Design a protein around this ligand. Structure first.
Ligand code: MG
Ligand code: ZN
Lengths: 998, 653, 133, 41, 96
DNA sequence: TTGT
DNA sequence: ACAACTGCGATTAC
RNA sequence: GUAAUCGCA
């Protein structure tokens, strides 16, 4: 009913999954709970499943995220306990536990953390019929039956009939024996099966037969069976049929099954995981009920139903699931695009799925079945390549667990038009043509030829024979790839790089829309969740920075805005009002604009003038030369907020005490602290200052200091008293600093077309090359990247952007504009440039001799360059990786307790690692002393290291260490714990004496 | 040429229980012996203090603090005044607490245990020495059985002489009552033994010479006609022969290695030093507590009464041996023995073996002090020996050197004032930092260090930024592109290391790849484009002229300097042809083509016009003038190379 | 990465520790044996040390213990030399170490490998690094 | 390098003696490697 | 390519490296026992097998590297090869 | 898983 | 039974 | 201090 005439919601998948869960999965799980009766009198407690009612959360989301509490709902079910002596059943409602609730965006709040549930792709239960060719002889044919639990009832055939099951570890097993054990009398078996001559010539249980509803259906499909859907059990007729098909495969009457086909796979959504978690929680609850009944019998007391049930199992189960499950990950909130793209991921790796190493090559390639249902250019780069992928824009999840795609039906009928979400297996038996119909050759139009898809193949057929047509432009891609303008002119390899780099953008202090776009930024910003959308019609009577008042139908609703908040990836979140006071807004329109969004469209970068030429080497490899205008005009300024927290953990000996007056500290510090041991709001701090001062008696000084690189204003501090832990808990003090970061040498910039670079010099505007207009270019890029990485759409974008800037237009172009004609992008770009040149009379914009190229001058000398250069205004983004974060340096500070090597990590102030591939290079160069120094006194030799500082301060020569490092000594100790000795035992060549080194 | 003889020989072997005892045994001043671990307790309850005679005991291992003791009185080691080495009240010695790192312990085991490596590996050394099958030994170790004759060097009255006794149903109650009960206990060891005494008696009472003799005899017997038989029989004969050869080799090695097979069964188990397993609590220590608990329960059951049931003590012996197996090496038997959270326990074999094991993670790879990483950018005006280095990294790398500089000059009195001045970012600190590293070499390196050119050496130049500048021509070596790559920095402290870095590891000394000896540092992307534009040429044929010149180049320059000046003054274009006079060199590479036209006048001077040059001569066969036809690009490249060579030669003097 | 690691281990020990080991045997390199590729023959001869004198009539083109160069290879292919005896790590008299003459010219600078150089590691890296392509 | 425990048990039972004429042997021991400047001539 | 490089170096089977090489090796192993007697048959067979295996092992690796344009010097391949072909296996018949 |  | 790239950095969960 | 997960080049 929805998504067949417009782009569906990006978060509709999680929405419908959570809805189906709450609708049916809770009741289905509550139905299967057993009747607790563990006694001689058989005192029985029961839960009335019909009286299942969830309750609204006691706290709001804005309070859960603030107080680090979970956002859940209360499950109340009426229960009846029939006592043995009372001979009656008292009925009361019990609080089983809390069930987490999902937001409209798909995210859940557990312990104050935003977490998303990534979907998993698992093979569907069924019969599979693979084959394998033997080294010598005929090819072996095998049929595997897959169960919901994961049972494998294999069947094999040798050169003879030899219908042997591979269930047993032994050589083989008799299929006739299995059929006789099933119930067959050895006569009806041969009577029912086809080709009975072959069968007659040849002369644990619950989990294998636990076929799902899906399993039943599939079994019926492959092996024609009329077994009702309800009977989801491995019937012997199914086995008989399986055998029949297997023998038939030997004579050529069969078709093997492709296990990479989607129709053979199921998708597990948040509902499937929540249902299993609820079942496990119910099992734990039944165990706890049995235990408390056993205890009440020991204490000679018949208790009320409330006394039996405790709220622990449900809460602890859901908490452990959200905390430790491999398919529950924290939401990435670097930019609004990440929030939406995170919930569309489909993963092969997971609990019950292929591990990175396990996955065969075949698993990781596109299968023709993935067309329109999965993204063919969005994967995870690394060892898990081809195992983590996204979900198509127009896809939906089906009733049977299969992803479905929208296909138009061009076949003539009563309606003559349909949009059907065909499942993966069904679209194979259809002629799907993605081409247009704008061709006439003096014959009827239906006689024209067009490429089409049939039986997982490509072929050319007449328009009379095509049943389906793929009209939607964004049907075969995902949100990440669809945001790439002119994607047809870019290589498929660079598309993945561009999709990955769009995810890294940092929201800037100011936002500007893109001149050239694909038109998906609107719905992206709509479904991102960082936008204020009204839920009621009315008028905006009052406008304020903190809140917005919307008066409608005699009711006033207040919407709270976000003012300089902090995301999970240290990126600022802020919202600004868009609508003025006194205008009407419908239910759905935009009230305010969040970060990285202006005018309701996603805006992850800026539009700057760009020239493609080499400049004095500053552009070698990939490197960008940028002007100072981007610096002193705050074009790429961004705000980053980092949090630091230390809990006041109360030890058994003494609790921690927070005092401002702490001795043994210099007077230059502690200025920011208040009367209480905490920094004040609005205080500028730097590296090595004290944020929270604690006496820590148990006295000492476990304080909070700033690390290297932390220089920002203290925006807010929170004193968080922790409760609900069944006992007094430590208070938490969270400080927040805001670091304004400008664009600097070493920062990464990127373009939507896969172009990435690192700034190398900030030249002034006077030295920058200027156009014939007189304006200096903002950035200069290397023109040799285009033939290397094969990105041609960037040129188009630059030019169209120049044209737009001059004519004050914004172009939202759907991909694959060459379906209309040939060189449609080129025609559009050249036409818009000419118009700009005519309207604003700048002849330079369109040069008839070389369209799209102009001749610029040098800022230094003032002489024109020989060849023309490309001048445009592309959309450049600033990436999260920044130099400040990557800078690091260690002299001699801290060591590991056991290894005694220097520590790891930039935050921990640790050195760099000399691996085996570097020791090899050092040995090849022949630098023995450098290797020895690095392996002993710069790393592990405690005495030598202690002496190094003294020798360097005094200035004396550092002697060569002769003792063994701590790593070797450790080995000796370990090996001798393993009862193995190790002695150096050096022998002097002078006097032939053995000397042990300890 | 007598070489410098260095002789170092590491040695490994099985250690006797006496040595593992002497690794821990120590004699206090009072006269007690310390070293035995007997209690599973690691630390006190809500006191965070080491428990006595425990896994972390101060008495047996050492004090937890330097100069402090568990008794409560601090002392100074090495003082002039006489001080007792160890407190009379408390066993802990007054020493620096580094000993806890290097000090070992040992738990005495009432019932012996068998090493997992020797027993349960597919090649079983115990099953090799004792010709008894591996299944029999694994049973006798794990499943209650009996071995009839474990001693062959003592008198034996009973004539059982059996390999595996599957049951004790044989009459033994009438035999024990008949003999004095103490007497029965005395000879039961020579009689049927069970669990861990039979293996030790077989390994101890054994003659390796008789073993090699019998194995050689059986080898000589077999192989006469086994190959003639079927493949199965030949395979069995071959496997037996290989087993016999391995037995011979093991016995021959045991004869002359001062190592006894008795040490394969562990009477006493060593305990790792406490610091190496610091409690946060480790599994090592969890398994240690488990084996300690099981061993003390076994000792209690043994010391309680001899009339105790054999089943209980045997089951506790099996539990002790399984705990010892899980401690030493888990996973060889195939049983994971997970924790309370269904997680497998780590063992010493898992610690040593693995990529993340002891060897590869620690010994062959480690991190160093004096190191920093940052992103890399192009510095296109640097020399092959110079590299741009940020100041915030240099101040941390060379911090000790600038401290020494502040101490030497009258700028800082002490180390603290100098460190405070360095933290304050005073201007003199940067001057001292510059003066410090003018002759110091920096070792840059990259994470994918595939070849030997991944690590090189440069001269650090102080820059104002956060990005490490690198020379462009040196990028190929590091496979570096400025798209986000990062690099590390290393400072050689010793003078020998500085000499090595400055002489061997510099870029000017490594210009040829070690694969085929080809130039690795060459113009790649933009310099190649510039050179190609310089030396490309000019439009020669129909491109330069619209009509044939038959119906109907111009500039003549005496010096290359004049042509370059005219190009700088925009008089002539880059590709514009010209004539350049040469001083009798004829070094221009060209095709072997005869003159296209030769003009000979009456007086004797003949002009020879070639494709790219004109050579005027006279009647005396004397080359009067030579004019080369080229462009400013070729002469510019030639002049820049020649002037580079000449400037190098002049600067040498 | 995996291939680069294993190779280094096998040949890690080898280091040039002798100027000459005394071997009188050398492999015979002839073009017609392997279809006579000129470039491959030149690459094979360049960098090796001769183990036997090459005579074209009374004159000796190159004697023993001499390092072949591009000019010598060109003279050999011009004079159509018969199978040439050169030194190689195969004809060395030891497996733990090699000598300067058996190894030949150093790839780094262009002279005999100096004593103390570890050629084993170098070869492993020179084989592993181009394995990416 | 691949089977640490096996070769360790084998060398322990045999009693092997290793003379540090290799690079990784001195690397583990933390000493001067007999290569280049570490080769005494 | 690179999988073929790994294969030759780890000599899993001599048929993998070449069929002609395995044929010649088994032919020598069979025939050389007849002629040249006991003391001068094993040595000459070992030398012939070493020569043929080294020549083969190199030619294969160098061809695999040159098919893609990678130019490597035969010396580096030789050092490694020597180690592969530097040990001998005593037969089961002789024990002393 | 893939092969050893 | 054994092994299957090198390192770095970030987070949360114990 | 260890895991899980993602990213980086
Ligand atoms: Mg790169
Ligand atoms: Zn296009």
């Amino acid at each position: 009913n929805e998504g067949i005439s417009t782009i569906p919601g990006f978060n509709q998948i999680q929405f419908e999954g959570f809805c189906r869960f709450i609708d049916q999965g809770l009741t289905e799980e509550l139905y299967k709970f057993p009747k607790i009766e563990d006694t001689d009198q058989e005192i029985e407690f029961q839960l009335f499943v019909e009286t299942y009612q969830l309750v609204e959360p006691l706290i709001k989301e804005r309070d859960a995220v603030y107080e680090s509490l979970t956002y859940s709902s209360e499950l109340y079910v009426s229960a009846g306990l029939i006592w043995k002596n009372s001979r009656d059943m008292q009925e009361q409602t019990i609080f089983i536990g809390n069930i987490p609730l999902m937001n409209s965006l798909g995210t859940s709040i557990v312990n104050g953390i935003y977490r998303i549930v990534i979907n998993q792709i698992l093979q569907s239960p069924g019969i599979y019929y693979r084959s394998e060719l033997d080294h010598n002889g005929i090819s072996v044919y095998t049929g595997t039956i897959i169960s919901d639990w994961g049972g494998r009832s294999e069947l094999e055939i040798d050169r003879k009939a030899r219908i042997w099951a591979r269930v047993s570890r032994k050589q083989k097993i008799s299929i006739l024996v299995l059929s006789s054990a099933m119930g067959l009398n050895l006569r009806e078996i041969l009577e029912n099966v086809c080709y009975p001559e072959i069968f007659l010539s040849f002369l644990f249980f619950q989990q294998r037969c636990e076929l799902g509803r899906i399993g039943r259906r599939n079994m019926n499909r492959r092996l024609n069976l009329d077994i009702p859907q309800n009977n989801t059990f491995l019937l012997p007729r199914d086995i008989l049929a399986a055998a029949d098909h297997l023998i038939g495969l030997k004579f050529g009457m069969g078709a093997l099954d492709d296990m990479n086909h989607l129709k053979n796979k199921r998708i597990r959504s948040v509902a499937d995981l929540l249902q299993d978690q609820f079942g496990l929680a119910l099992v734990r609850l039944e165990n706890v009920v049995r235990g408390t009944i056993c205890g009440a019998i020991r204490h000679k007391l018949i208790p009320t139903p409330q006394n039996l049930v405790t709220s622990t199992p449900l809460t602890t189960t859901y908490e452990s699931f959200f905390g430790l499950h491999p398919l529950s990950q924290v939401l990435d909130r670097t930019n609004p695009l990440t929030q939406i793209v995170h919930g569309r991921k489909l993963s092969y790796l997971g609990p019950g799925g292929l591990t990175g190493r396990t996955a065969s090559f075949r698993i990781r390639d596109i299968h023709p079945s993935h067309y329109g249902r999965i993204c063919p250019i969005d994967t995870s780069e690394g060892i898990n390549v081809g195992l983590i992928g996204s979900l198509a824009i127009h896809a939906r999840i089906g009733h049977w667990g299969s992803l479905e795609s929208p296909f138009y039906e061009i076949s003539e009928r009563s309606t003559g038009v349909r949009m059907l979400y065909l499942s993966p297996g069904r679209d194979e038996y259809y002629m799907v043509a993605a081409g247009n119909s704008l061709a006439l050759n003096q014959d009827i139009q239906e006689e024209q030829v067009v490429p089409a898809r049939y039986r997982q193949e490509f072929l050319t057929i007449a328009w009379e024979q095509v049943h389906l047509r793929s009209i939607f432009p964004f049907q075969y891609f995902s949100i990440g790839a669809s945001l790439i303008p002119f994607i047809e002119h870019n290589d498929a390899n660079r598309a993945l790089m561009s999709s990955n780099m769009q995810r890294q953008a940092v929201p800037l202090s100011r936002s500007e829309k893109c001149i050239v776009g694909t038109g998906l930024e609107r719905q992206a910003a709509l479904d991102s969740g960082a936008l204020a959308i009204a839920e009621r019609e009315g008028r905006v009577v009052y406008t304020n920075t903190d809140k917005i008042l919307l008066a409608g139908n005699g009711d006033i609703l207040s919407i709270p805005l976000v003012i300089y908040q902090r995301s999970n990836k240290n990126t600022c979140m802020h919202q600004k009002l868009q609508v003025p006071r006194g205008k009407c807004i419908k239910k759905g329109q935009i009230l305010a604009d969040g970060a990285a969004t202006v005018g309701g469209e996603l805006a992850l970068g800026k539009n700057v003038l760009v020239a493609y030429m080499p400049w004095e080497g500053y552009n070698s490899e990939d490197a960008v030369l940028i002007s100072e205008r981007l610096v002193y005009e705050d074009i790429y300024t961004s705000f980053h907020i980092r949090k630091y927290e230390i809990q006041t953990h109360v030890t058994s000996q003494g609790p921690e005490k927070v005092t401002n007056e702490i001795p043994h500290l210099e007077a230059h510090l502690l200025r920011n602290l208040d009367k209480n041991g905490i920094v004040m709001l609005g205080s500028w701090v730097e590296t090595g200052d004290i944020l929270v001062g604690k006496l820590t008696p148990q006295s000492k000084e476990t304080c909070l200091k700033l690390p290297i690189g932390g220089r920002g204003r203290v925006i807010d501090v929170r004193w968080i008293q922790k409760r609900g832990g069944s006992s007094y808990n430590p208070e938490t003090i969270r400080v927040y600093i805001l670091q304004k970061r400008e664009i600097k040498v070493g920062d990464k910039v990127a373009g939507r077309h896969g172009n990435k670079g690192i700034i190398s010099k900030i030249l002034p505007r006077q030295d920058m090359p200027y156009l014939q207009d007189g304006r200096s270019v903002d950035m200069v890029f290397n023109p040799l990247g285009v033939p290397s990485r094969m990105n041609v759409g960037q040129i188009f974008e630059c030019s169209l952007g120049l044209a737009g800037s001059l004519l004050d237009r914004h172009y939202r172009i759907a991909p694959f504009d060459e379906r209309y004609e040939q060189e449609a992008s080129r025609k559009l770009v050249f036409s818009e440039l000419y118009e700009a040149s005519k309207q604003t009379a700048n002849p330079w914009v369109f040069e008839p001799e070389y369209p799209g190229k102009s001749r610029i001058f040098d800022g230094r000398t003032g002489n024109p360059f020989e060849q023309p250069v490309i001048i445009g205004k592309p959309y450049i983004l600033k990436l999260i990786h920044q130099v400040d974060d990557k800078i690091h340096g260690r002299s001699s500070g801290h060591y590991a307790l056991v290894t005694q090597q220097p520590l790891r990590g930039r935050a921990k102030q640790g050195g760099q690692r000399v691996g085996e591939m570097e020791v090899w290079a050092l040995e090849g160069f022949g630098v023995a002393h450098i290797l020895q120094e690095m392996l002993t006194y710069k790393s592990d030799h405690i005495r030598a290291r202690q002496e190094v500082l003294g020798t360097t301060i005094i200035g004396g020569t550092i002697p060569n260490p002769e003792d063994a490092p701590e790593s070797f000594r450790l080995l000796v100790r370990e090996l001798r714990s393993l009862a193995l000795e190790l002695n150096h035992f050096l022998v002097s060549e002078k006097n032939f004496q053995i000397n042990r080194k300890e | 040429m007598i070489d410098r003889y260095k002789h170092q020989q590491l040695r490994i072997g099985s250690v006797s229980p006496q040595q593992i005892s002497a690794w821990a045994t120590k004699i206090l001043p009072n006269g007690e012996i310390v070293g035995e671990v007997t209690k599973p307790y690691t630390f006190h309850y809500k006191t965070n203090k080491p428990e006595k005679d425990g896994l972390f005991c101060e008495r047996i291992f050492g004090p937890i603090k330097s100069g402090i003791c568990a008794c409560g009185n601090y002392r100074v080691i090495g003082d002039e005044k006489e001080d007792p080495k160890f407190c009379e009240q408390c066993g802990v010695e007054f020493v620096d607490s580094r000993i806890r790192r290097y000090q070992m312990g040992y738990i005495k085991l009432a019932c012996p245990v068998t090493h997992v490596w020797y027993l349960k590996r597919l090649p079983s050394y115990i099953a090799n020495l004792l010709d008894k099958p591996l299944k029999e030994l694994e049973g006798l170790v794990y499943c209650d059985f009996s071995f009839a004759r474990p001693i062959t060097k003592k008198p034996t009255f009973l004539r059982l002489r059996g390999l595996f006794e599957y049951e004790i149903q044989s009459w033994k109650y009438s035999i024990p009552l008949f003999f004095t009960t103490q007497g029965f206990d005395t000879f039961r060891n020579r009689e049927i033994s069970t669990g861990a005494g039979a293996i030790r008696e077989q390994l101890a009472d054994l003659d390796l010479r008789i073993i090699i003799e019998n194995s050689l005899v059986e080898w000589e017997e077999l192989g006469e006609e086994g190959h003639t038989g079927n493949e199965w029989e030949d395979r069995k004969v071959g496997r037996r022969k290989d087993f016999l050869v391995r037995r011979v080799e093991l016995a021959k090695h045991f004869i002359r290695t001062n190592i006894e097979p008795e040490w394969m069964v562990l009477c006493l188990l060593p305990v790792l030093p406490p610091e190496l397993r610091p409690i946060m609590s480790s599994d090592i220590n969890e398994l240690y507590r488990r084996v300690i608990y099981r061993n003390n329960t076994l000792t209690d059951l043994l010391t309680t009464s001899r009339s105790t049931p054999g089943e209980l003590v045997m089951c506790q012996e099996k539990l002790v041996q399984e705990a010892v197996d899980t401690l030493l090496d888990n996973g060889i038997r195939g049983q994971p023995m997970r924790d309370g959270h269904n997680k497998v326990y780590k063992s010493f074999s898992d610690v040593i073996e693995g990529k993340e094991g002891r060897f590869r993670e620690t010994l062959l790879g480690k991190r160093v002090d004096y190191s920093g990483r940052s992103v890399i950018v192009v510095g296109p005006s640097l020399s092959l020996h110079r590299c741009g280095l940020p100041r915030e990294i240099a101040i941390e790398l060379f911090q000790t050197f600038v401290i020494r500089g502040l101490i030497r000059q009258h700028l800082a009195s002490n180390i603290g004032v100098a460190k405070s001045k360095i933290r304050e970012k005073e201007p003199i600190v940067w001057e001292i930092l510059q003066e410090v590293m003018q002759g110091h070499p920096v070792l840059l390196n990259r994470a994918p260090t595939l070849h030997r050119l991944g690590i090189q050496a440069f001269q650090p130049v102080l820059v104002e930024g956060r990005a490490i500048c690198l020379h462009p021509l040196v990028c190929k070596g590091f496979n570096a592109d400025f798209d986000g790559d990062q690099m590390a920095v290393h400072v050689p402290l010793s003078l020998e290391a500085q000499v090595e870095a400055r002489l061997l590891m510099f870029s000017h000394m490594n210009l040829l790849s070690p694969a085929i000896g080809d130039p690795i540092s060459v113009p790649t992307q933009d310099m190649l484009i510039g050179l190609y534009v310089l030396t490309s040429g000019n439009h020669r044929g129909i491109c330069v002229n619209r009509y044939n010149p038959c119906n109907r180049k111009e500039p003549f320059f005496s010096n290359s300097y004049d042509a370059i000046g005219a190009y700088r003054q925009k008089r002539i274009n880059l590709d514009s042809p010209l004539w350049l006079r040469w001083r009798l060199d004829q070094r221009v590479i060209a095709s072997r083509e005869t003159p296209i036209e030769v003009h000979y006048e009456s007086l004797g001077t003949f002009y020879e016009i070639y494709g790219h040059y004109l050579i005027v001569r006279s009647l005396k066969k004397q080359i009067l003038f030579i004019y080369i036809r080229t462009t400013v690009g070729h002469i510019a490249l030639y002049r820049e190379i020649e002037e580079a060579i000449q400037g190098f030669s002049r600067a040498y003097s | 990465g995996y291939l680069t690691r294993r190779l280094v281990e096998v040949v890690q020990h080898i280091v040039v520790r002798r100027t000459d080991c005394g071997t009188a045997r050398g492999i015979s390199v002839s073009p017609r044996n392997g279809m006579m590729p000129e470039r491959i023959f030149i690459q094979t001869l360049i960098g090796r040390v001769l183990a036997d004198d090459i005579y074209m009539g009374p004159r000796c083109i190159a004697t023993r213990n001499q390092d072949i160069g591009i000019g010598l290879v060109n003279r050999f292919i011009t004079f159509r030399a018969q199978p040439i005896s050169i030194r190689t790590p195969f004809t060395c008299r030891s497996t733990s170490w090699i000598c300067r003459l058996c190894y030949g010219r150093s790839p780094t600078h262009g002279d005999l490998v100096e004593l103390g150089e570890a050629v084993g590691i170098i070869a492993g890296q020179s084989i592993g690094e181009p394995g990416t392509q | 390098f691949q089977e640490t425990a096996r070769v360790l048990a084998k060398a322990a039972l045999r009693g092997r003696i290793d003379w540090l004429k290799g690079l990784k042997e001195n690397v583990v021991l933390g000493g001067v490697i007999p290569v280049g400047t570490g080769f005494k001539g | 390519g690179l999988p073929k490089v790994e294969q030759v170096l780890e000599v899993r089977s001599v048929d993998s490296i070449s069929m002609n090489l395995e044929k010649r090796i088994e032919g020598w192993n069979k025939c050389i026992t007849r002629i040249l007697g006991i003391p001068w048959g094993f040595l000459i067979g070992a030398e012939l097998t070493i020569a043929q295996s080294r020549i083969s092992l190199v030619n294969k690796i160098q061809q695999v590297y040159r098919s893609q344009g990678v130019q490597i010097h035969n010396r580096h391949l030789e050092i490694i090869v020597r180690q592969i072909t530097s040990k001998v296996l005593v037969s089961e018949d002789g024990m002393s």
